[PDB]
């Protein structure tokens, strides 16, 4: 039996024997959390959720899990869980390239609170384009969507009757909104919390253009730097699925062949370590 | 006093009866960041127009300016937007705007600021500023949406590595005041049809989201700022396809600000 | 069914259907706590205490709940609880004016770790007198009582045989006592923790004068700024009830008509939202 | 070294053989707040009598004073209460007391401090100090227990808003050193029968809780401090209804402190 | 019935009626933790582990429990536990002198993450030698053992094939190891976490000399400052027991008579308060 | 440039064509501790060789040195170990080593550093340094492994109490730079057969754990540092029982460093 984790912003589902049960923990990131911390979260909110017995080898995929901060997780993951084999963890980005591309080779994009892209060559990401973040890049993410949204609403750049609703729907006030992007933690996550307002107002010819465009640019500024002219692109992540209809629409008008598009990669990510 | 500020350089000019007698220049003052007993320390080391010195944070300067400086008149500490509304509009109505490290616009009837748009900041809005230009410059260049050598010369110019540019906009202090020190790289490459279009669009946007709100079909929109002067050519060039009459566009607002208190001194 | 909360220093009782069960959480204050925090406390130490099912509309009364920091609670209270209607929260001070004055109009004073006073005009507090705090004001509170107490004991201003008992009863040492008022958090709460020593030594002709006086001044320096000459005053809060006999005594010799006096307002606070 | 301190102004006076040759004045030093390698930095930028320089924190100054200053004699760093016990009592017994930003009292037999009362602080005790006067002044005034215009003139004098006065005693640093900069408002309004009674009572209390403990029916109680001199009239006026003989009451203790080391120099 | 605690680094076992059950909490130290904290740990992770009913008098032995920080524990220990008698706590060092020397007099050394020594005179430690810490002193502890170990391994001062194993066994990398001793909390505890590597490689003629020596110096630099020439020495603590065979070996070649040596003192520490 | 650093004193020497024209001396610079806009502030208040200025932290100085200093040549900022490898080895191969507040060793082929041992730090390794000597000095003395009066004179010399020495190596900043300011107590007591053996062993160890690794049976090991010169006698005395040829042993590396850039200036 193997244990598999795919994590990041917000929660972190925890799904198998030889080909059994999922658990609902939180998101683990070693770029905000430390090691003398995650030994508690796994022992407190996970240990009583496990089916007991000795494990084999877990493969941790998730936020901040880099080839540089990887051991931060493996040094704690091992000091908390009952395993005899060994623990492995790869770039959160790889969690997609193994679940969307499995054993083959191709592009893989994770569009969540951040939009990142890779070139999976059947072995690993043979080249990456650091999205740069919800400010300089990340073009086409909840972060960048919440940003742009409030950016046009708190500026009367949209129907005056849509701002009154947005302001009351989130109960936020203009000053708080601004104080929540320049003076507080996880702005990328905050702005992103105002993402659904877009999927709830797609009738507005404007809001839809606020989503389409975002993805247009992402395609022409974040993925086109590969040999897409001869390869299919797959997707993963909230905003990616939630706007599936809208997303691929741009892919069409951008001479690129969109492929597999689903919220979580854990599906075929099970069929990778078995 | 009469002093104009802008986090970087604050030009002072003590008036006497018609013109400056002797001017100095102490680094930018800002209560939104600086401490009273730290400006009361700095200054010791009247009309005041500073950045981020809103009418709620005004009394922070008026105290530090008194303790350090000997003056028995009437102490005033207003915004940096009001300084432009005074120098660019004088006494007549106008659409005061500034394009510093952060763009801004307001409506000065002729006595005070009545209707002032709310530029969010270097992240949410500030379209058409000194920091936003960098936010777009250090972005497109670092996003391979530009030549291969232009990127090598760039980073070889500021001696900055990509993994440190990131550590300078999110992690370290002042991301907009950092994206401004990269702004110059633009004015020095207005040859490329791209880098120039990275400014035009960021200027068409400023209008299509700020000035175009006030009654512009009757009032003259006057600009001011270190980026407003540095990019004066493309400036009105942008006011070409938006349809609007651009007026007084001077770099420093101190000029017309002296013409405000030139009545009683 | 409505949910009602009255909170502040120390715990926070949580009591009804159409006119059902109380819960024992802790005190929530958005002037020391943040929003990305209270979503946990309500989900952790409250959720498993609820009777399940969808609620209607809760009315949060408590510490730091101001018309300025109010949404801090309503933005988290909503993101944690299972409600469909809407959440409401008013000044902790109002929690008294609605439970002691109900629908009528009159004065209302909360004497707890802090002494605050209002003028309820049947609609809301039509005028307030910021007590200023356990240092400049708050005259007549546990904070101000603990202060004054230790102030006279740690100065040999009281029976030398009463100081030895106080020092050992709290196991505190003079230096700790001083280090707990100038260099640590919630001094108003600490000094206030030494309040009971007064209700346990009321035989002492001195200690009682240490309580009476405190309330005398409060009446003549914190409430008399209203039209008390034609209105009845009610009370609420620990020190208010615990010293009920002593309190109203001053009210007598201060030409004012004391009225309803009870520890918590939740009683008739139920009969306000039903 | 000979130097007297008091967080605000520390008057220095290098002795030679009978009197001061040249004096200076560097801001107040206090290890209880300041860092050794920060006084060792400051000073570089012997008998020492400072505030909050208890015999446990004494070696903090003696090191910083040596590293910065060239002196091969005997380095001493004592309290600020001992400076008054020396200047006000000299060599003869006495009841040394100080009324700075924080009142204090002690008993100096004639060689050292034997019995020293423990003034708690500006919150717990310090009755009859420079900070407590403010603690009562910024309180009664802000508590409407005084005229309506007296409150308007007050806040119009220090340019402080009520919601900021709060943010200055609880939230921001040094609440007692802040309630002292408001102390002056009292000496400038001793006309009102109230403001004057806000001092008297705060002075009757000092005695009824500090000096009246030591054997006062035989020893002279000598005062000193910026508030002790500023309110000298009401001072002994309070020593009128308490029944006690008030002695040497000088503002600066440096005078009689030189008369202490005037033996060997 | 009395409650007894012996604590320090890592966990803290909690064992009796008149001469009943142990509990497994964590380590409480008032030199890193505060009082407005331990009231939670005892109420959260201990209260549901107790056999209920009113207690008599607990005797807290453990980290940071000094005659100066003692009340930090007794002020919280009392405000959390259901006791009517009184609480007592002595130097963690004394926890050994009462369990190894009981009522008699003699030396007592605690060799754990830190090596401390005392002279128990039947009444109390009549003289102490502050070990000074895992840097200037503590000679002969896990701290000092982990230190010395990594000190010779990360310097190729040992078999090159033993370093590759150490580095992979702890999954640590040289830079992390250094960043974990100069820039992070509880280094004494970290370095000490690499202690077992020594008890797992005692075959190496070198590693054993890395342990023997450590204890040799400890004897000749930390305990010999007493009248050992006429008194027996007892031990307590992890590294003390784990290397029992190796330890006393030095005692032999150091003209000193080693005596009782066992991991925890709680054994006879029960037979002290009964 | 040419400047050598070492957290304490950084000696500057502006070269012209063959020798120093005028030298200064500003406190030690170190990005590993100091902030760019804090060195850009400091300096304003080329070849650079500093402490803890690894090739990863090099661009931190090269920017601050440019903003503050006017220079249009080629800006370099290298380690402090490379400065010794250049001054002690010049152009010919050698075993560069330093014995400052932290010992170090490396192998300079004749163009750069190829094989550099990794001295851990003042706690893990650094055997044979300025801080480690204190780590052993403030330890054995405070461990009664030395005379009774030697301990009294010691603490009476630095005016430090045992319970504060602890608060200076674990709790307070810079434990190795603190254990260096105690280093001098050794050179002033090389009479005792013990204190001298506390250095020898700490020097035999340096060799038996650092230099003895490189091919020492053919290359000359050159030293440098404030502790390397202060203890020059015992130095080579230790190189007596370890069997190794000690070469250029100069206190400051600036001498031979000028002989490096004396080619083009």
UniProtKB/TrEMBL annotation, chains A, C, E:
InterPro entries: ATPase_NBD (IPR043129), Euk-type_GlcNAc_Kinase (IPR052519). SUPFAM superfamilies: Actin-like ATPase domain. GO terms for molecular function: glucosamine kinase activity. CDD domains: ASKHA_NBD_PG1100-like. This is ATPase. The lineage of its organism: Bacteria, Pseudomonadati, Bacteroidota, Bacteroidia, Bacteroidales.
UniProtKB/TrEMBL annotation, chains B, D, F:
It comes from the Bacteria. Coiled coil: none annotated. GO terms for molecular function: glucosamine kinase activity. PANTHER family: N-ACETYL-D-GLUCOSAMINE KINASE. This is ATPase. It comes from Bacteroides thetaiotaomicron (strain ATCC 29148 / DSM 2079 / JCM 5827 / CCUG 10774 / NCTC 10582 / VPI-5482 / E50). The lineage of its organism: Bacteria, Pseudomonadati, Bacteroidota, Bacteroidia, Bacteroidales.
